Each structure stands twice: as C-alpha cells, then as structure tokens.
C-alpha cells in the first residue's frame, strides 16, 4: 500500500495495455502525482468500490531531451470486489500522422480490464445469475447496465439504460460463454439498438464464484464509433 495511489475490494491492478512499453502514464489527484510504466501495479486499495474514480492523466514520452505530452485528459477507474477496469477520457491529443499539432479531440477509450478471472472449467453447473452495475462513456458515467447469465446454457444477455445519448441505450444480444487461450470465461456478442445490429461487445466473468462481469462495448451511432465500459456485480 503506497501513498501516491492512496490519494483519496481489488487491491492491485497491473497496468499492461493502458500504457505501452515506451511511454509513461502520469496520474494526478489532489495535488499528488505518480508515474507508471508498463506492467506497474496500480494500488486500488484506498479507492472505493462501485464508484467511478477520476484522475487527471498525461501520457508522456521522451524525445532527445524533452518531455512530450502525447495525450492528456481524465483517467477513470471502476473498482469492484473482484474486478476493475480503466478508461481514457481524452481532452487533448497529438495528430502524429496528419498535422503534428495538439488538438482538443474529445474521445473515449477503454484500456485495461483485470481481476480474479473465473476459470471456464470451474463455472457453476447450472442456475441463473443477474448482474446490475454501471455503464460509462464519454461525458456520462451514470449508465445502468443489467446483464443476466444462464449458466445451464452458458449464455448471457443484457441491456444498457439511462445514458445521456439515447442511441447508446442498446440491447446486449445473447452470446455464448467460451474459454480464452488461458481458459478464461468470456462472452462476446453483438449490439442491438432498435432491432438492428449496431456494433459488438465483450465481457469477462470475474470472481471465484462468478460474482462479477466486466468489459467493453463498441457501438456504431450516427456520429460513428462509440466506446462504452461495462461493469456489473451481484
């Protein structure tokens, strides 16, 4: 338990996908800042459960003696008893391919999902579970996600409601529970807004008793891509 993650359930979160090997992630809150590389643990100890927690974040790289800010904005973490996921609310980003200038581009992105993975071979024999929780995205962390898993058929389906953008109140189509290469319980399915397939989604089952689900969704709205983070518990 450090103090730079104790600025203000799951105790540790290995940051592997949210920061690449060549850059650094600087997270700041209440006047305190900590820097992380790839693989560095993020102490979620002092963080409170089931609340989306915000930090100011910058992605920094070193180019021949000068600090370069690749992107900057809000870094959001959702912490549960056995799982946790992190997202990137981008306020400024560098157009390293077209213009070379920093642009205030508002964009959502989901970086990491970690926790106590439920082994696919150790799933409940039968019965039904219902997970209620939070779906968050750009400008809205108040979305309500209700998912249901039938362990007898090893299937799941759900819904998102109470999102600021009405086109993102989608139906989570029925999908099969399948194992990963490491044999982890994962569901992957389609996104149904107004009886039409409008994107894809993925969730992972977390906890020794499959008490949590957490993952991402990608929706094709009239404005294009839309990234949503999902996390529900019993």
């Amino acid at each position, epitope marked *: 338990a450090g103090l730079a993650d104790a600025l203000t359930g799951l105790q540790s979160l290995t940051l592997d996908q949210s920061v690449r090997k060549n850059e650094k992630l600087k997270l700041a809150a209440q006047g305190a800042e900590k820097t992380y590389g790839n693989g560095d643990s993020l102490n979620t100890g002092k963080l409170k459960n089931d609340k989306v927690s915000r930090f100011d974040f910058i992605r920094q*790289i070193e*180019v*021949d003696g*000068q*600090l*370069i*800010t*690749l992107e900057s904005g809000e870094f959001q973490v959702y912490k549960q008893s056995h799982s946790a996921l992190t997202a990137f609310q981008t306020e400024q980003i*560098q157009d*390293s*391919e*077209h213009s*070379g*200038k*920093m*642009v*205030a581009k508002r964009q959502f992105r989901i970086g990491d999902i970690a926790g106590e993975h439920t082994s696919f071979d150790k799933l409940p024999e039968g019965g039904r579970a219902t997970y209620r929780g939070t779906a968050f995205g750009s400008d809205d962390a108040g979305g309500k996600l209700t998912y249901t898993i039938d362990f007898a058929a090893k299937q799941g389906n759900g819904k998102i409601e109470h999102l600021k953008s009405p086109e993102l109140n989608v139906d989570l189509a029925a999908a099969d529970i399948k194992p990963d290469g490491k044999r982890h319980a994962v569901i992957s399915g389609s996104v149904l807004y107004n009886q039409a397939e409008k994107g894809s989604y993925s969730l992972g089952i977390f906890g020794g008793k499959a008490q949590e689900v957490a993952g991402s969704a990608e929706v094709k709205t009239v404005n294009g891509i839309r990234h949503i983070g999902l996390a529900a518990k019993q």
Partner: antibody
Amino acid sequence: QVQMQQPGAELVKPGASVKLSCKASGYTFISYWMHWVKQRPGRGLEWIGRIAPDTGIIYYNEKFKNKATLTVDTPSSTAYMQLNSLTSEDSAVYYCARYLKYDGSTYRFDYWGQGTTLTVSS
Amino acid sequence: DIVMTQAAPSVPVTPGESVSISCRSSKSLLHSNGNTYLFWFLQRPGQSPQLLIYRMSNLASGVPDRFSGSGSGTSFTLRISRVEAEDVGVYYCMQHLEYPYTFGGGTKLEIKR
C-alpha cells in the same frame, strides 16, 4: 550530436533525374518528420514537401507535384528527393530540415542541412 | 496557399539602435489550440537558415534576448533591440499552420554605419 549530412553539390545534364540524399544522425529519426526547402540563387526560400518516416504520408506542394519524389530509408537514417526532367529553373540550393512530429518542443526547423547546390547544365 | 508578405525588402538601422520587421498573412495564423504557428528565421550570407523565433514569441536556443516577436493573427513583427554587426542577414517568416508551408519574401537588415 544532430548531424544532417548533405552532399556538397550535384551536377547533372538537363532533362535527366537526380537523387539528393540527406543522412541523419544524433536524433531518433522515426519521431522526426523531414522537410525539404528550395532556394534559387538570389531569391527566397520555397517549401517543396514533407516526408514522415513513421507512416509514409507525404504532403507535397502543388507546384512540385510531378517534379519531386520523396523517399525515406528509416533503417539507415536517410531521406531522398528525386528530381526528374530537370530544367534550368531547378538549379538551386536544396536544404533538408527536421521537424518533430509532436507539438510541444523546440525541435522543429531548429537543425538544417548544409544544402546541396544542384546545377543543371551540360 | 497562405500568402506571407514581407512589406520591406530591406530595412535600415544605425548601429546600436532598435528596428522592426513586419510580416503579413492571408489567413489568421492562430489555430484552435491557441498556439500561433509562426516561425522566424535569419539567413546569414552563405549559410543555411537558422531558427530564431518559434510559436511567434519564444526565443530559440542560444539566441540573444534583444530579439522579440509580436503580432496577433495577420500582422506580426520581429524587433531587434540593440543591433550588432552579427545580426545582419536576411529575415524570413514562415507559417506551419496549414499545408503547404509558405515562406516570406524576405527582409534584409542594412546597418547604416
């Protein structure tokens, strides 16, 4: 230890084609875009184009559309500009300059090449 | 195409005095990010251009404080405070806001010795 090695001068017959090189050392080539500038004798500077060793996207000037071809060899840090159907109006000094692809730095047009003196005559 | 106009082909100044060079554009050089993307260069005789001013205000590495950069969106000025013989050369203004990058016509510093 920024170094932009350009050949001192190049002499070619009119109507032929020449490749002008700009070798880079002392800085991370991939993160820096490479721009080319042409100055005719007794005249001002003119921007030709920009190459990106990261991606390969090349932004040309409309005037030099069919006159210049930009290439980059990232493995051995070098940029090349190919000039075809050379006329007299192309005899000039050509500079290569670096330009960090990220905003937030002083490493933009700070280091320039010495400049290749291209003379087109028989 | 952004037209950069240097009104004065040459500019006279007695040694030890101060002097200004004017640059004009066709579109505003102020992007939405707030930075004014204007570069000022000095070309000494027989030498490649050297960076003088970046972002329209900030001095480069190892360049005297007597050089100043002002201007707002279409009108910009470079001010030399205590002119020395080393400051002689041809001054250029170039925008890097919109492609293609366009250079100024050129203004020559002429010291009235």
